[PDB]
Amino acid sequence: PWADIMQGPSESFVDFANRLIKAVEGSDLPPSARAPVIIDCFRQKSQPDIQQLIRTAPSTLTTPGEIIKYVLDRQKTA
Amino acid sequence: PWADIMQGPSESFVDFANRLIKAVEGSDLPPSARAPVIIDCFRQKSQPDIQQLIRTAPSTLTTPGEIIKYVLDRQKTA
Amino acid sequence: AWTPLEPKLITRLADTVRTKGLRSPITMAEVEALMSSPLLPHDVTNLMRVILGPAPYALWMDAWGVQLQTVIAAATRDPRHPANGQGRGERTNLNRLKGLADGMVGNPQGQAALLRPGELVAITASALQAFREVARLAE
């Protein structure tokens, strides 16, 4: 179930994005509703450090690929 | 007095913008000096979280309405 | 002939926006009610000046301009716009939509004289969409 996917405390972001995109594209949603759902799940899941990282984006991110690129650039190396 | 207006620690941004625009437009400034003053007061008042949010704007904001829209988009939901 | 909206209705709508907010369905219904007859740019501009605060009014001016620009792009993409005419001399500029054209600045009577009904309904729909955007943005 896509709506139950959370980014674990120790999980990296690319694994979380892979799992989420997999569960959203392999589901019962229409094809035209996958990108907005993936974006809004990146924003509300993806534990509050990345949540604030996406929130304070000086540019407007309108695509899952752009969000992934931005987060991978500005992520907290740890 | 417009130059004494600060965004309180607990005040929202739309209330601060309303108060500031009110005090600037209902003052003794010429009509052609209100927009630059409102912008530069958004930048220097509006406590340092929003200050840094406006500073790191990938686009150049040249209007109080555009600054308000940008800040409302990327503000820290709390 | 131009007839202004009742200040009683405008006061009631302003208090509705003040208590219920911008996004409540009752507020949008009231706005749709006061957005029934095609309004002149003067009417909608003063209405939003009265019912909205300063910062929402700035946001609404921005959004209204953007929506009117989209309308004018669609108009130059189709010469059969109810605001346009058949010849090139009836093409509608943004100065005529925002009420900035010659013979219209500050004068609602002249505004009502030169404007087309298609112009009025396009301006009205644009203002309604801009209000929706700003309401979704403010809260």
Add this chain to the structure above:
Amino acid sequence: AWTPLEPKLITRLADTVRTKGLRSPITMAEVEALMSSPLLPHDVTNLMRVILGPAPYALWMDAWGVQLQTVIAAATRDPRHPANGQGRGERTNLNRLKGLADGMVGNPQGQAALLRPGELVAITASALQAFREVARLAEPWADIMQGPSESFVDFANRLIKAVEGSDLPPSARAPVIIDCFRQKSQPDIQQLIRTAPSTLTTPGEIIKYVLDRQKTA
């Protein structure tokens, strides 16, 4: 006539990407191999759908679009593009490159019918460059030190790997590798390189010199 790529080769390439990763030179060689004949947008799209995960696939779609847009800018900057024609009626739109044009959406046969060979090779080169970008993006040289017990060839291997697989320009790798050999590589080898009667101006020469005169232990 359109012929699909073998699912056996695609399965082997997918497992290669799964075990070796996106950035290994063997993986890039395999991709270059399966990128030999000019592919139709359908082929490359399905190939990247199968071999890449969901998030790398999104990144790759983005990068492919950007590279195709650069190609179309160069095409409108030169009417002699092998994808273009001489008249204005042969100008190639991005709907025709991404396979979105009329008579192409979802149909590989019609795609192969209307597309030009120059179009195919441009799409293919764009997809290869996008794959390179995403591979460099999906997965630090200045933090590499030679351990107290580590040999010198292992340290050199690790350092050259991290420097060549990084964001430096190609013309800045050799000087950085040399200056990292000189300042890292614990003070015995530091003094060994410092007191070199000859001037060493290449990482290979430094490696050879150090391997010759190293303290056998």
Add this chain to the structure above:
Amino acid sequence: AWTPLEPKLITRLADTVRTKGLRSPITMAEVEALMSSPLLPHDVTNLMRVILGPAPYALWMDAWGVQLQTVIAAATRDPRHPANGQGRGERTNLNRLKGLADGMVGNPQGQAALLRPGELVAITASALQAFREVARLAE
């Protein structure tokens, strides 16, 4: 037309180099096998990038450059090189041998277009000798 080497053969050769080493006669035989047809600079460069580690790859780049320079000295010492031509306009520069010349950088198709068969066999023999040197040097 350029055809790439099979990644299956390259993977098998890489594992051979990984288990047997660089200097075993079986490894040199396998390299001679995959060095049968004249390869373009792109092919040999990617092959050595994949089968060799980082430090042996640096050593091999050095040795390949030195051997190609010896070849170019012999070429300027004899205008009848199978890479050269009769006139001075066909003289082969190191940018054309290393694949750095115009129309070749990063493009294997254009590479295969402009290169001569004598150029290809000279590059291939140079790369083989450089591999032998590096293998004798690494262990």
Add this chain to the structure above:
Amino acid sequence: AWTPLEPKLITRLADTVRTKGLRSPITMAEVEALMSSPLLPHDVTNLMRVILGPAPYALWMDAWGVQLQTVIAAATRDPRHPANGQGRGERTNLNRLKGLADGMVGNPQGQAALLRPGELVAITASALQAFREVARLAEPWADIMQGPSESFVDFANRLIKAVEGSDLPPSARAPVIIDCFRQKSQPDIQQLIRTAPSTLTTPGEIIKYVLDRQKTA
């Protein structure tokens, strides 16, 4: 007619070299100042004899000879050198450049008589380049870390100093400074730079960003 340089200016320049060193930008500016008018070999030779110590003077003689030899190679490679003439009888030998030719040894008046203005400016530029080489030679960036208690502007100053006063090419300093800001500069600032919503592509921009968002303490 030959006029000597003021011993007062020479004494001030010698004390400048004594206190600031050979490589300070103020010292190079002062040398450029006293290198304004084209000097005769006698002038430059005595100047370097006075301002430089014995060992730097030996190094400078070597470097000056090498640079003059490069100049003479370029001169025999082009008969239109401002030191050369059109016929072969005006070709300039190194004895004429170093002041060793006939009628010049030890005599500055005869020197000024026979020398060309192009000869003088070539000698002067050669001497300046030789001084630069010796200064860079007479007196490590990859070992610089930001101390636990050190501020960021001090660390940036130290790092930029050590990177610009090193053996790197000019086109490799900015990327190295950036990548050293990112990997040095203890993990608080490392994470501050990592989580930059904008892409910082210049040391000045990185410094400005860090100074804005730094943890006041």
Add this chain to the structure above:
Amino acid sequence: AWTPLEPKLITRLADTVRTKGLRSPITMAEVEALMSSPLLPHDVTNLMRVILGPAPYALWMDAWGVQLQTVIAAATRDPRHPANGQGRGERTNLNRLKGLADGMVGNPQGQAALLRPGELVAITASALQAFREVARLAE
């Protein structure tokens, strides 16, 4: 003919910057004093190299580049720039402003030869504004 600035004045200005700082009005007055005659890119570059530390010098190079780019945008926005000419062959590129053009790199004499007085005064004003920005930024 190019004449260098006195190292005595430069030493005094450097010590002024060292004791008073970058932002004191006396320091800005001294800089305006040494910024009186139009300087060549070589002069200003060496001056800022000597008086400023490493990090302020990096900041100043950045700011100077940005201000020169604004100047070149204004120059392409007006063909009557005192640095420009009337025809298109006198358009001034940033390589000519920063001293990077052909015949100027490292040579102040050739620099002074090819540069225009309008070029010199524009470079000087740009450098002064950049110094002001960096001084306001450093402290």
Add this chain to the structure above:
Amino acid sequence: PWADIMQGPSESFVDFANRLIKAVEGSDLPPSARAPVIIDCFRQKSQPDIQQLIRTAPSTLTTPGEIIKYVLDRQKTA
């Protein structure tokens, strides 16, 4: 006296070279005998680490400047 000059255990090489060249050029030797004496004093003074560094020179150094350059290149940083 030039023939009594030794490189101290803690002294750098450029200071030793400066002192030696000073004492040799400011002495009673003929001008044509200074360079060979400076070279042979670099070789026999200049404590045995630099002595061995000069001894094992793959090239032949025939000038004090060349010896100084070589030693400065290959010296033991400490």
Add this chain to the structure above:
Amino acid sequence: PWADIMQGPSESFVDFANRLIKAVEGSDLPPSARAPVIIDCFRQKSQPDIQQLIRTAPSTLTTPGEIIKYVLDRQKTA
């Protein structure tokens, strides 16, 4: 036997060169194969100090006499 000749730990280099050249010239090799063999025996015999001394030769030594001269110049006096 020439291929069994090593430079002893205490032996000087001229004695080793004499012994090696004697054994190589008084052997069954062709006359055109003596110089390369003598050179390659200087390089691989002649205990690792002189081996490294010959290896790090800035010039290319292509004759036994030149190698002998170079080694005698730059040898470690002991």
Add this chain to the structure above:
Amino acid sequence: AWTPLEPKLITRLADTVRTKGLRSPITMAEVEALMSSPLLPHDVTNLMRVILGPAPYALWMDAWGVQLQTVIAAATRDPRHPANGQGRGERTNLNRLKGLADGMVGNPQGQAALLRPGELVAITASALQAFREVARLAE
């Protein structure tokens, strides 16, 4: 007519070199003694073959060649060399000095026939200087 040196004197000189060494003043005096009459290349070559060991003999061949080359450079720098003649047909090549010219290889009689006395004294002085160099180099 060529007369060989006494093997008794050569044996005594060889034992002198064996006991006293190459650099003793008595050894140099003895060499000067046996270097009194101008010797043919054959004589000096065999003398150095007998008195010197293998490695000093190689060094001496090198040094003798270098000194003879300096002599031939001075000879082409002055057409009045006692080895040269006035016309260009008497110019002395190194094959004639080292005894490698035609009619001289291995034959001392023909050597003595074609050689000039200036040639002989130049060869002798060159050999003496080469012996001095090698003696200073060996120990």
